[PDB]
Amino acid sequence: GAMNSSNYAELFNNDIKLFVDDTNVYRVTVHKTFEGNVATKAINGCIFTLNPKTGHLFLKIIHTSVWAGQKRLSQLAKWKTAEEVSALVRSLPKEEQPKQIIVTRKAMLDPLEVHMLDFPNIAIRPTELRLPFSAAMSIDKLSDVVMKATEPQMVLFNIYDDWLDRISSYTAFSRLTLLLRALKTNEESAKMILLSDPTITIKSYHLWPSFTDEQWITIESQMRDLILTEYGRKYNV
Amino acid sequence: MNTVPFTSAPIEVTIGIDQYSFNVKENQPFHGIKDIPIGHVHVIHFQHADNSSMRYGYWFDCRMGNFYIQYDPKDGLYKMMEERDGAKFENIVHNFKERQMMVSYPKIDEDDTWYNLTEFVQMDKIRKIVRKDENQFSYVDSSMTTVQENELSDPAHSLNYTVINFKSREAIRPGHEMEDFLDKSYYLNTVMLQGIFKNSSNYFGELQFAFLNAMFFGNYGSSLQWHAMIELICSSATVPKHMLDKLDEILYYQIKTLPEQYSDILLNERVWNICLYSSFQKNSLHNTEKIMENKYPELL
Ligand SMILES: COc1ccc(Cn2cncn2)c(Cl)c1
Ligand SMILES: COc1ccc(Cn2cncn2)c(Cl)c1
Ligand SMILES: COc1ccc(Cn2cncn2)c(Cl)c1
DSSP states (O other): OOBOSSSGGGGGSSSOEEEEEOTTTSEEEEEEOTTSOEEEEEEOEEEEEEOTTTOEEEEEEEOGGGGTTOSOHHHHHHHHHHHHHHHHHHHSOGGGSOSEEEESSGGGHHHHHHHTTTOTTSEEEOBOOOOOGGGGGGSHHHHHHHHHOSSOEEEEEETTTTGGGTSOHHHHHHHHHHHHHHHHHOHHHHHHHHHSOTTSOBOTTOSSBOOOHHHHHHHHHHHHHHHHHHHHHHHOO | OEEEEBSOOOSOEEEEETTEEEEEOTTOOOOEEEEEOTTSOEEEEEEESSOOSOOEEEEEOGGGOOEEEEEETTTTEEEEEEOOOHHHHHHHHHHHHHTTOOEEOOOOTTOOHHHHHHTTOOHHHHHHHBOOTTSSSEEEETTOOBHHHHHOOOGGGOBOOOOOOTTSGGGOOTTOHHHHHHOTHIIIIIIIIIIIISSHHHHHHHHHHHHHHHHHHOOHHHHHHHHHHHHHHHTOSOOOHHHHHHHHHHHHHHHHHSOGGGHHHHSOHHHHHIIIIISTTTTSOHHHHHHHHHHOTTTO
């Protein structure tokens, strides 16, 4: 059934699973035409497929060419997501294939179930959690590879950097969701927090800066405040 | 005109024959039903006064044999049986008629309800859905489960309806996932019509038989088959034009005949609203949509 607050910790057991988020697959800018009508221009997108135990991120870049000549693009985008997740699973050796796939939006269940009929043993699950994976395009290096892509492309990342050498996957996921929740609620503030100290750099093979344990605590606290703050600014509390 | 002679009526029972129902009191001198139209299948069904649980009944065709009902006090039900000695049969029926101990199937110049409900239903197909090859008639009841229901427990007592699953490999071609799931024409026309049913009449026959089992016996799995066969047509963008027109007539009479007070359990809100108002065929069922809106506007 559904992944929620009660069974949260199943994400960190030893059964391979993936989260799939499709919120950045189909992306458009809305503009005015010369005649004063409105039209969309698509820009490159990405499927966010994450193993929460290992941090392994399979970033499938959705190039705008996949939309050419197609209709009902918001609906196509869910089936294209499912088509690409299915292809990923097929490409993996049997012992690396997920035992469960958790979609962050219920509208993905039928497209993915259908594309995964060949895998009756892989459970397709929704979730009641409001996870901040839409903010993945606020991570500079991920947005950069998406926007620079001239063809379909799969890029592999560890979204936890090296954190698992020092903390558990539960704690790494909590850190990531806090970072992404902050970037979603106020990207400018959030990014200011992360990069204000020029002496803390991002390694070439990392996504986030090389904070010490003590500096992550400060960072993490500053991200909480931001989220609480914006909650007041937003609600007047 | 054909006859179904009853040895007796030892227990109080509501007896139904197609869309008709009537009450027979315990040990009332009742010896059957006369004037049954030849040329159609029929169903004779039963609900005991003392245990309205288990509606049960027999599908039959009088052209295939001489059939009668006799109560079995060990198994506790009205059983259909076949009498092969045609002479001994005619005699017993004639005696019963002369003493006027039979009720009569009604006939009117203005009625085609039963024909319209059973138009494509054929005893030979019923006997493949309900397996019991030693008899020429077929027993159904409230509790019997379908093969599909069994998959998701005794197989000999199952309703062998055609499995219809929209999220199955049978329904979905590799490489046409979105196409085949959103437009089910391939599954309707190639898999089911050309492949399994062979023609639309056999398809409509199973659809009509599932409806009738749902209505007369409150057979849950039958209702599921009925809704699934409707939905497969309604969710298909390409349907032979003759099939759409015939479906509209089929469903019109089903809706017309449904008891007003049973609409709450035999009509799937999701399927009907989808079929009438969202599906490819939302504008192709004019008669059915007009009777649904005037009779059951609440469901919609
Ligand atoms: C009520 O109709 C019927 C018809 C045939 C039989 C069977 N039988 C008749 N005479 C000898 N055997 C019975 Cl018992 C009842
Ligand atoms: C043989 O079919 C039928 C049909 C209708 C009736 C008429 N009726 C009697 N009580 C309730 N309805 C009868 Cl008795 C037999
Ligand atoms: C033939 O149509 C169908 C549809 C849904 C189900 C699944 N189900 C629904 N209630 C109980 N089981 C089945 Cl068994 C058959």
